[PDB]
């Protein structure tokens, strides 16, 4: 009956065992993101999804279930991607970035405290709710059913984790890994490139291990010491020493008044144009 309820309009994303479609509800004409997941932990997470409510997390509107799939009728977010919307601003400050990160931290803290790990947190996952200038930023794809293609069986049979035993020191998803990812996104939000952007893949591995991050001139010249301090606490190499979302939310750059109001759009926008593949 899923085709009796919804008109399928386009594919918005696809992963190993889950995909998201733009759909129109036939009865009402309203648009939604339908996340289709190929079949205890998933059912327990759905139970939690049903109960939780956060202004920065896509709403679960309904669930349909077949013998082979769950169909999660989700809120559609139509405001565009984080970095596209920064390019369209014309003016941009540290406090603008801090306000986005505060929202992301709040969302991910709420997931974490309800036993959900976000997984593979990428800039593309962070979408504005509406076209309006003051729009909330939204987390969209997250949790057990995150669309990623991990290991050599992801596409073939929809099964993640086929990775040679010497490769992974630990299971690749955790609350601390989500926090590190938020550190990286913060870094790029303030300069327009990821840390160690110009290092080879092999050197990047070593640099990340070493954990001594750099804030190069001229790009970081007019950025606050507070911002750099905040970022370093999330990029911290030791996951036991790394800030949790809770601890990050209490840092002066987020919670206080250390975030600057200087226009950094000129440099950040040039770097986004230079460095983002889709520019």
């Amino acid at each position: 009956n899923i085709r009796k309820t919804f008109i399928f309009m386009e594919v918005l994303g696809s992963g190993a065992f889950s995909e998201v479609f733009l759909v129109k509800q036939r009865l009402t004409g309203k648009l939604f993101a339908l996340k289709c997941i190929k079949k205890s932990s998933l059912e327990n997470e759905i139970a939690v999804l049903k109960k939780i409510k956060h202004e920065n997390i896509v709403t679960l509107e309904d669930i349909y279930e077949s013998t082979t799939h769950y169909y999660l009728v989700m809120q559609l977010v139509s405001g565009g991607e984080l970095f596209d919307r920064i390019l369209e601003r014309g003016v941009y400050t540290e406090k603008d970035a801090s306000l986005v990160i505060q929202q992301v931290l709040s969302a991910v803290k709420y997931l974490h405290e309800n036993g959900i790990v976000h997984r593979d947190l990428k800039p593309e996952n962070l979408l504005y709710l509406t076209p309006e200038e003051n729009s909330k930023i939204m987390i969209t794809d997250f949790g057990l059913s995150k669309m990623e293609q991990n290991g050599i069986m992801s596409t073939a049979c929809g099964t993640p984790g086929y990775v040679a035993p010497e490769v992974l020191a630990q299971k690749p998803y955790s609350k601390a890994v989500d926090c590190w990812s938020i550190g990286v996104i913060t870094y790029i939000l303030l300069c327009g490139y990821p840390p160690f952007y110009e290092e080879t893949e092999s050197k990047l591995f070593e640099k990340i291990k070493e954990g001594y991050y750099e804030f190069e001139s001229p790009f970081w010249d007019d950025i606050s010491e507070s911002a750099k301090d905040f970022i370093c606490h999330l990029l911290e190499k030791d996951p036991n020493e790394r800030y949790t979302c809770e601890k990050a939310l209490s840092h002066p750059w987020i919670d206080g008044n250390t975030a600057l109001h200087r226009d950094i759009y000129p440099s950040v926008s040039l770097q986004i144009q230079k460095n983002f593949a889709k520019s």
Binding site: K50, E65, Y71
Partner: peptide, 6 residues
């Protein structure tokens, strides 16, 4: 072929 939750 679906059951609607709730």
């Amino acid at each position: 072929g679906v059951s609607k939750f709730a």
